[PDB]
mmCIF file of C-alpha atoms and ligand atoms in Angstrom:
data_model
loop_
_atom_site.group_PDB
_atom_site.id
_atom_site.type_symbol
_atom_site.label_atom_id
_atom_site.label_comp_id
_atom_site.label_asym_id
_atom_site.label_seq_id
_atom_site.Cartn_x
_atom_site.Cartn_y
_atom_site.Cartn_z
ATOM 1 C CA UNK T 246 116.578 95.687 103.549
ATOM 2 C CA UNK T 247 113.600 97.951 104.340
ATOM 3 C CA UNK T 248 111.549 97.227 101.192
ATOM 4 C CA UNK T 249 110.585 93.926 102.864
ATOM 5 C CA UNK T 250 107.620 92.106 101.280
ATOM 6 C CA UNK T 251 105.922 88.937 102.597
ATOM 7 C CA UNK T 252 105.554 85.411 101.133
ATOM 8 C CA UNK T 253 101.746 85.677 100.965
ATOM 9 C CA UNK T 254 102.069 89.037 99.260
ATOM 10 C CA UNK T 255 104.448 87.441 96.755
ATOM 11 C CA UNK T 256 101.891 84.760 95.831
ATOM 12 C CA UNK T 257 99.267 87.474 95.395
ATOM 13 C CA UNK T 258 101.629 89.255 93.007
ATOM 14 C CA UNK T 259 102.234 85.970 91.162
ATOM 15 C CA UNK T 260 98.487 85.268 90.940
ATOM 16 C CA UNK T 261 97.602 88.674 89.458
ATOM 17 C CA UNK T 262 100.556 88.400 87.029
ATOM 18 C CA UNK T 263 99.420 84.985 85.748
ATOM 19 C CA UNK T 264 95.923 86.518 85.496
ATOM 20 C CA UNK T 265 97.325 89.042 83.001
ATOM 21 C CA UNK T 266 98.948 86.390 80.786
ATOM 22 C CA UNK T 267 95.480 84.850 80.563
ATOM 23 C CA UNK T 268 93.699 88.048 79.452
ATOM 24 C CA UNK T 269 96.133 87.909 76.522
ATOM 25 C CA UNK T 270 94.548 84.531 75.701
ATOM 26 C CA UNK T 271 90.872 84.623 76.775
ATOM 27 C CA UNK T 272 89.535 88.213 76.635
ATOM 28 C CA UNK T 273 88.821 89.877 73.265
ATOM 29 C CA UNK T 274 87.722 93.375 74.330
ATOM 30 C CA UNK T 275 90.454 96.006 73.873
ATOM 31 C CA UNK T 276 88.959 98.310 76.523
ATOM 32 C CA UNK T 277 88.941 95.646 79.280
ATOM 33 C CA UNK T 278 92.667 94.862 78.921
ATOM 34 C CA UNK T 279 93.247 98.556 79.679
ATOM 35 C CA UNK T 280 91.664 98.650 83.161
ATOM 36 C CA UNK T 281 92.791 95.136 84.159
ATOM 37 C CA UNK T 282 96.424 96.023 83.347
ATOM 38 C CA UNK T 283 95.985 99.303 85.265
ATOM 39 C CA UNK T 284 94.222 97.586 88.174
ATOM 40 C CA UNK T 285 97.109 95.178 88.811
ATOM 41 C CA UNK T 286 99.707 97.939 88.389
ATOM 42 C CA UNK T 287 98.254 99.819 91.375
ATOM 43 C CA UNK T 288 98.112 96.631 93.458
ATOM 44 C CA UNK T 289 101.780 95.581 93.157
ATOM 45 C CA UNK T 290 103.394 98.883 94.190
ATOM 46 C CA UNK T 291 100.827 99.395 96.976
ATOM 47 C CA UNK T 292 101.984 96.127 98.577
ATOM 48 C CA UNK T 293 105.581 97.419 98.804
ATOM 49 C CA UNK T 294 106.732 99.975 101.397
ATOM 50 C CA UNK T 295 108.217 102.238 98.733
ATOM 51 C CA UNK T 296 108.935 101.748 95.056
ATOM 52 C CA UNK T 297 112.727 101.449 94.659
ATOM 53 C CA UNK T 298 115.116 101.684 91.674
ATOM 54 C CA UNK T 299 114.890 98.170 90.201
ATOM 55 C CA UNK T 300 111.126 98.424 90.665
ATOM 56 C CA UNK T 301 110.760 100.758 87.689
ATOM 57 C CA UNK T 302 112.783 98.368 85.496
ATOM 58 C CA UNK T 303 110.537 95.543 86.755
ATOM 59 C CA UNK T 304 107.119 97.193 86.194
ATOM 60 C CA UNK T 305 108.346 98.022 82.652
ATOM 61 C CA UNK T 306 108.480 94.323 81.684
ATOM 62 C CA UNK T 307 104.717 93.961 82.257
ATOM 63 C CA UNK T 308 103.775 97.047 80.177
ATOM 64 C CA UNK T 309 103.653 95.237 76.814
ATOM 65 C CA UNK T 310 100.143 94.428 75.575
ATOM 66 C CA UNK T 311 101.476 90.903 74.875
ATOM 67 C CA UNK T 312 103.693 89.073 77.399
ATOM 68 C CA UNK T 313 105.481 85.718 77.044
ATOM 69 C CA UNK T 314 106.003 82.626 79.215
ATOM 70 C CA UNK T 315 109.764 83.284 79.495
ATOM 71 C CA UNK T 316 109.043 86.933 80.322
ATOM 72 C CA UNK T 317 107.249 86.075 83.574
ATOM 73 C CA UNK T 318 110.059 83.930 85.073
ATOM 74 C CA UNK T 319 111.763 87.108 86.234
ATOM 75 C CA UNK T 320 109.863 89.449 86.442
ATOM 76 C CA UNK T 321 108.977 86.832 89.122
ATOM 77 C CA UNK T 322 112.496 85.494 89.792
ATOM 78 C CA UNK T 323 113.590 89.127 90.104
ATOM 79 C CA UNK T 324 110.677 89.759 92.507
ATOM 80 C CA UNK T 325 111.672 86.832 94.751
ATOM 81 C CA UNK T 326 114.776 88.594 96.099
ATOM 82 C CA UNK T 327 112.460 91.080 97.871
ATOM 83 C CA UNK T 328 110.736 88.558 100.170
ATOM 84 C CA UNK T 329 111.419 87.866 103.837
ATOM 85 C CA UNK T 330 111.720 84.066 104.118
ATOM 86 C CA UNK T 331 110.000 82.015 106.819
ATOM 87 C CA UNK T 332 112.215 81.921 109.903
ATOM 88 C CA UNK T 333 112.887 78.218 110.392
ATOM 89 C CA UNK T 334 113.645 77.601 114.105
ATOM 90 C CA UNK T 335 116.162 75.394 115.914
ATOM 91 C CA UNK T 336 115.032 71.974 117.308
ATOM 92 C CA UNK T 337 115.692 73.375 120.813
ATOM 93 C CA UNK T 338 113.233 76.311 120.707
ATOM 94 C CA UNK T 339 111.044 74.119 118.494
ATOM 95 C CA UNK T 340 110.979 71.425 121.187
ATOM 96 C CA UNK T 341 109.541 74.166 123.434
ATOM 97 C CA UNK T 342 106.661 74.612 120.954
ATOM 98 C CA UNK T 343 105.750 70.912 120.955
ATOM 99 C CA UNK T 344 107.048 70.366 124.494
ATOM 100 C CA UNK T 345 105.483 66.893 124.685
ATOM 101 C CA UNK T 346 106.574 65.353 121.343
ATOM 102 C CA UNK T 347 109.813 63.320 121.551
ATOM 103 C CA UNK T 348 112.567 65.478 119.927
ATOM 104 C CA UNK T 349 110.663 66.069 116.653
ATOM 105 C CA UNK T 350 112.657 66.931 113.506
ATOM 106 C CA UNK T 351 112.003 69.199 110.478
ATOM 107 C CA UNK T 352 112.155 68.101 106.818
ATOM 108 C CA UNK T 353 113.642 69.574 103.589
ATOM 109 C CA UNK T 354 112.913 73.243 102.759
ATOM 110 C CA UNK T 355 114.634 74.820 99.775
ATOM 111 C CA UNK T 356 115.059 78.609 99.889
ATOM 112 C CA UNK T 357 112.277 78.941 97.312
ATOM 113 C CA UNK T 358 109.927 77.138 99.703
ATOM 114 C CA UNK T 359 110.474 79.350 102.747
ATOM 115 C CA UNK T 360 110.033 82.298 100.388
ATOM 116 C CA UNK T 361 106.417 81.256 99.624
ATOM 117 C CA UNK T 362 105.429 79.965 103.065
ATOM 118 C CA UNK T 363 103.213 81.887 105.502
ATOM 119 C CA UNK T 364 103.053 78.792 107.734
ATOM 120 C CA UNK T 365 105.040 75.573 107.661
ATOM 121 C CA UNK T 366 103.419 72.153 107.828
ATOM 122 C CA UNK T 367 104.797 68.643 107.512
ATOM 123 C CA UNK T 368 103.151 65.258 107.843
ATOM 124 C CA UNK T 369 104.458 62.554 110.187
ATOM 125 C CA UNK T 370 102.741 59.595 108.493
ATOM 126 C CA UNK T 371 104.073 57.189 111.135
ATOM 127 C CA UNK T 372 101.592 58.709 113.618
ATOM 128 C CA UNK T 373 99.099 60.043 110.988
ATOM 129 C CA UNK T 374 99.683 63.599 112.085
ATOM 130 C CA UNK T 375 100.347 67.000 110.541
ATOM 131 C CA UNK T 376 102.651 69.404 112.345
ATOM 132 C CA UNK T 377 102.121 73.128 111.670
ATOM 133 C CA UNK T 378 104.314 76.077 112.685
ATOM 134 C CA UNK T 379 103.608 79.796 112.147
ATOM 135 C CA UNK T 380 104.345 83.271 113.543
ATOM 136 C CA UNK T 381 100.997 85.080 114.198
ATOM 137 C CA UNK T 382 100.251 88.843 114.414
ATOM 138 C CA UNK T 383 103.395 89.477 116.490
ATOM 139 C CA UNK T 384 106.439 87.499 115.264
ATOM 140 C CA UNK T 385 106.474 84.485 117.654
ATOM 141 C CA UNK T 386 106.645 80.667 117.522
ATOM 142 C CA UNK T 387 103.091 79.339 117.715
ATOM 143 C CA UNK T 388 102.665 75.663 116.811
ATOM 144 C CA UNK T 389 100.036 72.927 116.626
ATOM 145 C CA UNK T 390 99.585 69.364 115.435
ATOM 146 C CA UNK T 391 96.533 67.284 114.573
ATOM 147 C CA UNK T 392 95.366 63.969 113.184
ATOM 148 C CA UNK T 393 95.482 64.020 109.387
ATOM 149 C CA UNK T 394 93.394 61.265 107.765
ATOM 150 C CA UNK T 395 95.258 59.124 105.225
ATOM 151 C CA UNK T 396 92.622 59.681 102.539
ATOM 152 C CA UNK T 397 93.312 62.216 99.798
ATOM 153 C CA UNK T 398 90.413 63.654 97.799
ATOM 154 C CA UNK T 399 89.658 66.483 95.352
ATOM 155 C CA UNK T 400 88.015 69.402 97.116
ATOM 156 C CA UNK T 401 88.563 72.936 98.325
ATOM 157 C CA UNK T 402 91.145 73.492 101.036
ATOM 158 C CA UNK T 403 89.674 75.494 103.930
ATOM 159 C CA UNK T 404 92.999 77.371 104.342
ATOM 160 C CA UNK T 405 94.085 78.469 100.852
ATOM 161 C CA UNK T 406 90.433 78.151 99.714
ATOM 162 C CA UNK T 407 91.439 76.548 96.428
ATOM 163 C CA UNK T 408 90.471 73.160 95.004
ATOM 164 C CA UNK T 409 93.289 70.825 95.889
ATOM 165 C CA UNK T 410 94.220 67.357 97.131
ATOM 166 C CA UNK T 411 92.780 67.597 100.624
ATOM 167 C CA UNK T 412 92.785 65.448 103.759
ATOM 168 C CA UNK T 413 90.714 66.050 106.885
ATOM 169 C CA UNK T 414 92.792 67.697 109.599
ATOM 170 C CA UNK T 415 91.573 67.209 113.174
ATOM 171 C CA UNK T 416 92.960 68.814 116.322
ATOM 172 C CA UNK T 417 92.008 67.585 119.807
ATOM 173 C CA UNK T 418 90.349 70.433 121.731
ATOM 174 C CA UNK T 419 88.693 70.494 125.197
ATOM 175 C CA UNK T 420 84.938 70.541 125.964
ATOM 176 C CA UNK T 421 82.908 71.545 129.066
ATOM 177 C CA UNK T 422 84.942 70.601 132.177
ATOM 178 C CA UNK T 423 88.250 68.677 132.210
ATOM 179 C CA UNK T 424 88.756 65.169 130.798
ATOM 180 C CA UNK T 425 86.266 65.878 128.002
ATOM 181 C CA UNK T 426 87.880 66.610 124.635
ATOM 182 C CA UNK T 427 86.187 66.507 121.229
ATOM 183 C CA UNK T 428 88.014 66.743 117.861
ATOM 184 C CA UNK T 429 87.679 69.781 115.590
ATOM 185 C CA UNK T 430 88.958 70.393 112.077
ATOM 186 C CA UNK T 431 88.287 70.362 108.332
ATOM 187 C CA UNK T 432 89.805 69.592 104.927
ATOM 188 C CA UNK T 433 93.152 71.196 104.123
ATOM 189 C CA UNK T 434 95.874 70.686 101.491
ATOM 190 C CA UNK T 435 97.679 67.474 102.307
ATOM 191 C CA UNK T 436 100.946 69.042 101.094
ATOM 192 C CA UNK T 437 101.360 72.335 102.951
ATOM 193 C CA UNK T 438 103.953 73.869 100.654
ATOM 194 C CA UNK T 439 101.369 73.775 97.837
ATOM 195 C CA UNK T 440 98.826 75.290 100.202
ATOM 196 C CA UNK T 441 101.316 78.088 100.916
ATOM 197 C CA UNK T 442 102.043 78.555 97.195
ATOM 198 C CA UNK T 443 98.398 79.532 96.834
ATOM 199 C CA UNK T 444 97.983 81.212 100.202
ATOM 200 C CA UNK T 445 97.242 84.753 98.945
ATOM 201 C CA UNK T 446 96.232 86.258 102.321
ATOM 202 C CA UNK T 447 97.722 85.334 105.724
ATOM 203 C CA UNK T 448 94.391 85.856 107.557
ATOM 204 C CA UNK T 449 92.776 82.936 105.688
ATOM 205 C CA UNK T 450 95.152 80.737 107.652
ATOM 206 C CA UNK T 451 94.683 82.663 110.918
ATOM 207 C CA UNK T 452 90.952 82.199 110.502
ATOM 208 C CA UNK T 453 91.396 78.433 110.176
ATOM 209 C CA UNK T 454 93.436 78.241 113.417
ATOM 210 C CA UNK T 455 90.817 80.329 115.220
ATOM 211 C CA UNK T 456 88.373 77.671 113.971
ATOM 212 C CA UNK T 457 90.283 74.945 115.813
ATOM 213 C CA UNK T 458 90.921 76.460 119.271
HETATM 214 ZN ZN1 ZN G 216 95.573 74.821 100.784
#
């Protein structure tokens, strides 16, 4: 209840964990495995507020110099019950965010999804447009939408910064004096839940938004 970790922090923890199951496959040096293991141990607990009771039990599982593929799915599954999910709003106070769009509606969203999501984005292919909602540095509904091209292509996403299936996302800004508005944007993961899954640091995303305004 007060050991509350964030979705982006969870993905970080996942990414460093899956890094360790790879040093049991790629790296030969005995001395390197030592510091790597130690390096990630300090990271995990530092991300928490305080290390609880079932945090000892959990860090234990990783100790072994050889982990397994069924070993990771909890730890990880066990880790998931520590995350604050994304706060999905009601269409009324969502209509206030996109005050101009005609009573727009939200899609699926399993629990697992809101547990990994720093922002939430869905595509409205009818109007070739990606809607994005997020909270910002003081828990509040901030929302945008832009023109998402209908081309998908391999390439790095300028939000999660990982090679993905990207489509150019273009928001309509405003230039010098009124009535003059040029389009700004870049390539981002077409599917935003995937983007989120690999969104390791929430600022990456903030930086992208501050690129658009
Ligand atoms: Zn991405």
